[model samples]
Target: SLSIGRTCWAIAEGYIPPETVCILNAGDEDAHVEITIYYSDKEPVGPYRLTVPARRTKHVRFNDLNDPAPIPHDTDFASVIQSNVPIVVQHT
Candidate 1:
């Protein structure tokens, strides 16, 4: 989460698009997280529940969130992440 020391660029097209927001939990126990998505044209939602097992990594797609889909692919959006423990997030 950006609430942690690490920060990231929210650019999706100013640079590139990612296949997933890969979340990594390197702790000795399971970690739980939530992601809040902000869309340019729709109301922001979530705190989507997610969990990462000890020393495991999970990949999440934005469109797979909130519903079958949140919005159109052409729409722009940003995200803020929070976790029960420290984690590493990568866009790929």
Candidate 2:
């Protein structure tokens, strides 16, 4: 298993709401990823789960994670992306 993390990700209504994006790349084997976000002012968000096809990639935007009820605006959160198999995680 591998785990990667990033902090200071925001979805706020500021002059420039810096939306965060998550990108994942799986190795030769399919990988299961769990994305969790930690917030200073609230309970930790999810182990939002997904599967990455072998030798492929998955891209997710900040506001798309929780579906109809996405992460609220004006929230500052940190993220941890964990995988059952070797994988790469990137944020922007």
Candidate 3:
């Protein structure tokens, strides 16, 4: 089954500064994470896919996903993470 987690506050893509969000796989099974980002002033972007190996961690910077567009600069946003296995997440 897939588990879900949310970060209430986050900021990235701006003239001022940017933040990176990280996710860790704490369980024994490999986890596939799908991230959906909600932005304050723009259309939400998402299901940016990532794989976190068991006991390992991965990170995402707004600039990381630029296929369609990078997260707009200097904006406040929050993200939801869905994983096949239980996981831990943190952002800075």
**Which candidate tops lDDT?**
3
C-alpha RMSD by candidate, in order: 5.1, 5.6, 4.6
TM-score of 2: 0.70
For lDDT, candidate 1 versus 3, the one ahead is 3
Give the per-residue Cα lDDT of candidate 2 at 20. Answer: 49
Please report how far candidate 1 places residue 48 from its true position, in Å: 1.0
* Cα deviation of 90, candidate 2, in Å: 1.3
Expressed as tens digits, the lDDT of each residue in 15-50 for candidate 3 is: 315457688776678878777778766777877777
Query: What is the lDDT, from 0 to 100, of the residue 33 in candidate 2?
Result: 71
- Compared with the true structure, all predictions reach lDDT values of 0.64, 0.60, 0.66
**Best-fitting candidate, measured by TM-score?**
1
TM-score of each: 0.70, 0.70, 0.70
Model 2 weakest lDDT span, ten residues long: 7-16
TM-score of 1: 0.70
Off by over 4 Å in 3: 1-18
